[PDB]
A paper describes a structure:
The structure of CD200R was solved by molecular replacement using the coordinates of CD200RLa as a search model. CD200R and CD200RLa contain typical Ig-like domains consisting of an NH2-terminal V-like domain followed by a smaller C2-like domain. The first NH2-terminal residue for which electron density was observed is P15 in CD200R and Q18 for CD200RLa. The absence of electron density for the potentially glycosylated NH2-terminal region suggests this region is flexible and able to adopt different conformations. Intrasheet disulfides are found between beta strand C′ and the C″D loop in the V-like domain and between beta strands D and E in the C2-like domain. Superposition of the V-like domains (residues 17–126) of CD200R alone and in complex with CD200 supports the earlier suggestion that the NH2-terminal region of CD200R is flexible; a rotation of the main chain around residue 17 results in residues 15-16 moving from the front GFC face (which would impede binding to CD200) to the back BED face, exposing the CD200 binding face. Other than the NH2 terminus, there are no significant changes to the interacting face of CD200R upon binding. Conformational differences between the bound and unbound CD200R are seen in the BC loop (residues 37–41), DE loop (residues 82–87), and to a lesser extent in the EF loop (residues 93–94). These loops are not involved in the interaction with CD200, and these differences are due to the different packing of the molecules within the crystals and also reflect the plasticity of these loops.
CD200 is a widely distributed membrane glycoprotein that regulates myeloid cell activity through its interaction with an inhibitory receptor (CD200R). CD200R is a member of a “paired receptor” family as in addition to this inhibitory receptor there is one very closely related gene with activating potential in humans and several in mice (Akkaya and Barclay, 2010; Wright et al., 2003). We report X-ray crystallography structures for the inhibitory CD200R, the activating receptor CD200RLa, and a complex between CD200R and CD200.
Author numbering: 15 to 204
Write the structure that this text describes.
């Protein structure tokens, strides 16, 4: 293309995603094509040829459509984002004077499954399972901890924190989970 824009987009699982075809509206478009390359699947397209008003789709059963709009804007829509929607979304606009391309690296935000519990010998476990990206785990009060981060095949990350407190005056502890989808302070009785 004569101008290529590459960007990353993060959208929360289950939400609706709207992607603009280019950084600016392009008036003299003769052809608009979205090429969707999903993780482990053949590519499909949604296209619009301007002169004949010929709309196209080879994305049946992929839940990817043009956005519904009165002015027929070349915006792509994902009505309910699944982890499977991760991939490259490329919009190609042909104008008489040149090609414009916008490539989206679409990333899905996944709230972690949080489990927390006391363990034997004044210990506590706090785990943020299969979050995307990794959650962060901190504690109140600070303890002697071992925290691991395990990434899975799906791209989600399990963060597991196991602590012990050598201050016998401490009876209640709080696990603080931070994530792009949400944050929470979680109490544990030792
Ligand atoms: C932009 O993204 C495309 C598709 O993901 C890639 O092929 C291309 O190399 C990237 N451009 C640059 C300048 O890195
Ligand atoms: C293609 O058709 C859909 C409805 O099936 C419409 O929402 C969309 O605007 C059309 N595409 C373009 C760019 O006109
Ligand atoms: C991978 O992702 C799914 C969500 O799509 C999650 O529920 C699951 O726990 C993850 N897989 C493993 C083996 O952890």
């Amino acid at each position: 293309p004569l101008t290529q824009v590459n960007t990353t987009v993060s959208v929360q699982i289950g939400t609706k995603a709207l992607l603009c075809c280019f950084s600016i509206p392009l008036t003299k478009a003769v052809l608009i094509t979205w090429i969707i390359k999903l993780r482990g699947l053949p590519s499909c397209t949604i296209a619009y040829k301007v002169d004949t008003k010929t709309n196209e789709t080879s994305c049946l059963g992929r839940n990817i459509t043009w956005a519904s709009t009165p002015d027929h804007s070349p915006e792509l829509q994902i009505s309910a984002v699944t982890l499977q929607h991760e991939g490259t979304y490329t919009c190609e606009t042909v104008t008489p004077e040149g090609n414009f391309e916008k490539n989206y690296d679409l990333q899905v935000l996944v709230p972690p499954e949080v489990t927390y519990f006391p363990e034997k010998n004044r210990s506590a476990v706090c785990e943020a399972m299969a979050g995307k990206p990794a959650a962060q785990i901190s504690w109140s009060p600070d303890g002697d901890c071992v925290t691991t981060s395990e990434s899975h095949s799906n791209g989600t990350v399990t963060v597991r924190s196991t602590c012990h407190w050598e201050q016998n005056n401490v009876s209640d502890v709080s696990c603080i989970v931070s994530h792009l989808t949400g944050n929470q302070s979680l109490s544990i009785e030792l």
